[model samples]
Target: PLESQYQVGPLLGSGGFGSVYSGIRVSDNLPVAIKHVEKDRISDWGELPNGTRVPMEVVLLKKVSSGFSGVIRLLDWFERPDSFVLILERPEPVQDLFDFITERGALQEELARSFFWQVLEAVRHCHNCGVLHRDIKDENILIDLNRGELKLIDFGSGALLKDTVYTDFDGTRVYSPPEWIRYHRYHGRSAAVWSLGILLYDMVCGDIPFEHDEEIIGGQVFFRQRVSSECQHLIRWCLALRPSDRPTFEEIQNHPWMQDVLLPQETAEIHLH
Candidate 1:
């Protein structure tokens, strides 16, 4: 169904929590990404303290933005007792890093550094905004075909955390840390780094550190993880059995692989948030 001021078009994206559609608002006659949210599923997460999502997402989006500023903006939102809808800015074609990997095979070191630093920047932006984007995967990040920055999307994947050492065990099983897999008591942020480490590997290399398997990952088992010595140390830290053993997002920026490229100015800029 079309809104009183907008005309919906074909669907463009879908996730575990919501779907986005390409549409036009009649008022401004501008192309936009309209996000529709279902409340029935959101309530399953347990009671929300302030209010329900369908509206809170807009409020959060309005507050948090990154390098890809114009890529995702909250135009407006409509809330009803049953369903929720959001008006968002239109980003470029959804060419994720996954797509680039599929076509280009393994990625180069320089390219890896470029993508890694940018992703860290976006995540730092989220942390500063008081939003914990529990899920950071290839699909959730939009690669603007027009520009080069990695833009974080999908607030539905975010979790509102009340602590600095956050923990909420929800993420892709294969890429999550061993501690979280063996025990479901960890926060999502604690286990989230594993995926980023693998993403870094994929950006510079080709395949995942260890090929994915439920029994191997979730079952507290691992496959023959093969990677170069250069990244092996960092990758090991990511899969640490103890959450405390793993380096936080801040440690990643100081990693040897990223040391030269991530200069003092760059580090300070992100931390200043």
Candidate 2:
């Protein structure tokens, strides 16, 4: 009945675990993103040192982000003997943030502000739902240029909140907080803030603020484009050398740079069906 209910199409993307294909629901004929993940590649559900060994991506996509607007929507899923196929609501007219930034060189402050605010909203929603996306990078985000929609994707490195310090750091090294790089440990919230700082810089500047991981940990930063003082200050606020110095999601929303982007009410108005 796989082909009867769903008409699977071409491959959209592929990563360490498996491939993603374009698909459609036969009833409504609506487009969907089909994710094929090898079951063997993921750990089986069980008890672990920190928590139960559930698949992070599945838990987040299917549970944590149930009503979130700024994250990829999971429409349905199918479990096979060798792999699990996730049916996601395909984002139309979308491109990866990496390509979007590469084509534009650097984004205007207005554009960057819009994207950054959406990202923060998504991150905040994840935290509120007791999830921490350990990986937040340009490649992991998608943008709809015309509608200015930004969705956070790829939760392979995500973890559930357990009120304990995380010693392991996964995902891109360039986005790691200074403390995590030097000490191999960081609080979940602070690490997320640090990654957001790097993402904001990349959006407005076309490149990472630091030349290397060591430079990031050493508190060295370089700016390429001219921007507002408020924007610059907010970047520094998120990238503070000490995790404690970094601003919270609420503080970030209140930052001057984000004041004019989108109101809280505006965000709530956009939701997944």
Candidate 3:
């Protein structure tokens, strides 16, 4: 069925978990990313609407599939004897935020603001949908250079959102919150907010704030670039040493930095070439 409905192309990427390939839907020529993961590599499982047991990634994507523009859509999925195949929406002319920042050095404050706002919206939507994107980083965010749109991808690290503290860490080490590193436990929302701070810092500073565990534990964010005070304040608030000291998502949305009027949409366009 996969071969009949879609034409798989060259490998886009591969890792311990799986491999992703560029593909095109045969019927409509819609671009898609085809991910194949071995069953043994799946770290968790979830139940489908029909009570069919499936990979947690599939279930998480299904829960948040309500046409959320900020997140990558799961177009379809298929189960094989030893592996699973996932068909995902592929935005053309797109680059991950990590590479985007690497190429451009750093983004202007206004551009980072717009990108951050979209990431916040996408993460909030996931939380509302009862999903926690345990991994939130520049590498997980894809920017549509043509349309200035953002898409959060990679649900392999996602889990069902709950108020309880999470003891396990599946996210990037640089983005892990201080609480997780020190106490080996972190609340879903607080950890997500912390990662957002790291992502924001990376976008404007061209690198993450902390590289060493000691620096992360210290939780001191030194601004290398001169961004607005309001923006710095917001980043500091999110990177608060204590998990409880961090602002909630609503507070972040209402922060003074977020109130600034965004630059014109066209100004956000990233010219790679």
Candidate 4:
């Protein structure tokens, strides 16, 4: 069925969990990413509103499929006997945030400001949709070079949003919060904010603030390059050692650094062309 409906292309890249291939919808020639994950590798399952059970990643993506431009969309999926294939939107002329930053080194404060705002909006949308993108990092964010738009991807580490603390985290260690490393437990929003801090730092400083476990627990951020004090202040706020001390998403959005630039109003329609 998959072969009849789509044409699989070259290997894109492999992840810790699975491999992804480039593909195209046969009828309309729409590009897609084909992700193949073995059934045995899925550690979590979720029940949809209609009583269908599937991978938590799939469930999370479905919850956020309400036409948010900042998030990638899942066009379709297929469950084989031994593996599941996810057909995801593939935006052309795009590069992951990591590569974007790598090619340019540290980005300008204004540029980082724009990207930071969009990332916050996407993350906020996920929260509102009752999904927690537990893995928020540069590599997980794709930037459209043509449109200057960012889209959050990779829901493999996501989970349903809840008030309870999470003890098990499969996200990148460098982006994890101090509480998660120190206490082995962290609230969802706080940890998400922490990862945002890391992302912002990486965007503006060309590197993550913390590499070692002790560095993260120390909660000390040193700016290798010159950065605006307001930006530094917000980064510190998000990286606060105490989870309760971190600013809420709203507070981060309203921070002086974020407010300095006037971003264009967001549209409800997806940015696919």
Candidate 5:
């Protein structure tokens, strides 16, 4: 019955190839997250009609992301074979890095380091399991206000990639790495590290290292070298040319700040929320 089926409400968010909605599983009158594809965004999943990229959402959400209880969780999902539907963990809005930075003006050193550690821990787990989260940002990362977990969602299918690199006009270029910008390439772990550095900078400094709002790739570096040597290390390491040169998640875990300012946090709920 239509009542048994889910009902879509006002749009929660939209991007890539789909839009998220606040919905109700009318059968239970419970809350759930739903992602849907329009004709325009359908090409994003499979072969495009012409010049289009496959939608990453279907694949990313199909598989659950491993992290802490606070991360985004999938309750169930449905697909039309040609289109897609995703029911995810209903979450309260978390802070967007853009808005968060704009309001805060800058991030505190300890706080920035703390969040970085949390993100790295999650990323490391994904890498270990052979999952590569291709798209990561403030908006994708959610915060469960009720449980206070920093949830990462919206994998779609774009999160997983092979040895082949990826480069498209996706994501804010400010957090993008120079190597990626120049190449439009994707490295398994290295690219993730670069994003980490950018996030840290934004969390603490309230701005990405090289964003001029005109050409995200063409810019010089910002050095607050004297403030903290380790932070500088994090920034440089994330922006390194070679993925191998970048510090491994294990190394990040061992970092003084990772243990001090950052602690490992990840878990799964016994039952879906």
Candidate 6:
């Protein structure tokens, strides 16, 4: 009656896409997250080569499930007359980064570094797989505080990698790069790097650097807290006004700030724990 072998319960969260519920697999008693959506509510659908209609989210999810780590794995899905349900692997004791930040106000540099590095790994994995997560905000990330693990979620707004210029804004405006706001087009990689910059500032500064969209377009940012010199420099490099000025993921992972945590204590005098 529920459309599959999963028993769904209370709602976990809801958005423009639909609602997610906590569920249990009837076969193995394993916990899962179920996303239920009214079939008619999905706005984006594409026809396969054979001319069968399918949701773009499902296509992207299927692609992401192919050996992609650091992302919530899609286990299964079911199509019913009125609705569709997606079964996803559920990680235990997880908290959204936004909620975690709300409770803690801000994080120490070391903790922020760890979280951002994990996000970078996930983003890198996605990019390497030819996927682009257009929305890379705190709300889209789940953080396992005890284990220091991160999972990137919500691929509804994502797209396959392409060399085209993106004009439509499906993501949060505050995290947008200057080109997206001023010129109405931006490359995916640079836009993602810009979002990472905003996320980093939010993690260590207790709030976003810019409250208004024009501020970001104007390249106007002011730091409210005292940050280390290395971190400060990295932030500036990421938030550069022009997309070409931003550092690549390769450069970011190699930056002195990121390298400090990756090195062994005996060799680099830095310890994460």
Per-model TM-score on C-alpha atoms: 0.76, 0.88, 0.96, 0.95, 0.76, 0.90
Comparing 4 with 5 on TM-score, the higher-scoring candidate is 4
lDDT of 3: 0.89
> Can you write out model 5's per-residue Cα lDDT over 140-181, one digit (the tens) per residue?
665443343565665554455456666653555666666766
- Which pairs in model 1 have colliding backbones? 167-187, 168-187, 168-188
Task: Judge candidate 2 against the unseen true structure and give its global Cα lDDT, from 0 to 1.
Answer: 0.78
lDDT of each: 0.63, 0.78, 0.89, 0.88, 0.60, 0.81
What ranges in model 4 sit over 4 Å off? Answer: 260-273
Clashes of 6: 0
Worst 10 residues of 2 by lDDT: 264-273
Candidate 1 lDDT over residue span 78-192, tens digit each = 7667667888777554466677777777655555666677788777776677766666666566665545556666766566654544445444555665555555555555556
lDDT of 2 by residue, 1-273 (tens): 566788989888887747999888999989788888887887524332345444567777655546666888877666677777777777776789898788878888876787788888888888888778888889989875446578888776678765678987667888888887687888999889999999999988998887676788777567889878888999988999988999999999998788778543443244211
- RMSD values for the candidates in order, in angstroms, are 5.9, 4.3, 1.6, 3.2, 5.9, 3.5
Sort by TM-score, top down from the best: 3, 4, 6, 2, 1, 5
Question: lDDT tens digits, residues 100-138, model 3?
Answer: 898888788878888898899999999999999988999
After superposing candidate 3, which stretches have Cα over 4 Å from the reference?
261-264, 267-273
Compare candidates 1 and 6 on lDDT and give the better one: 6
Q: Count the backbone clashes (under 3 Å) in each candidate.
A: 3, 0, 0, 0, 21, 0
Better of 2 and 3 by lDDT: 3
In candidate 5 the C-alpha lDDT for residue 149 amounts to: 52
Off by over 4 Å in 5: 1-3, 27-29, 43-56, 65-71, 80-83, 157-161, 164-169, 212-220, 223-227, 262-273
Q: Residue 93's C-alpha lDDT in candidate 5?
A: 43
Residue 181, model 3: Cα distance from true site in angstroms: 0.8
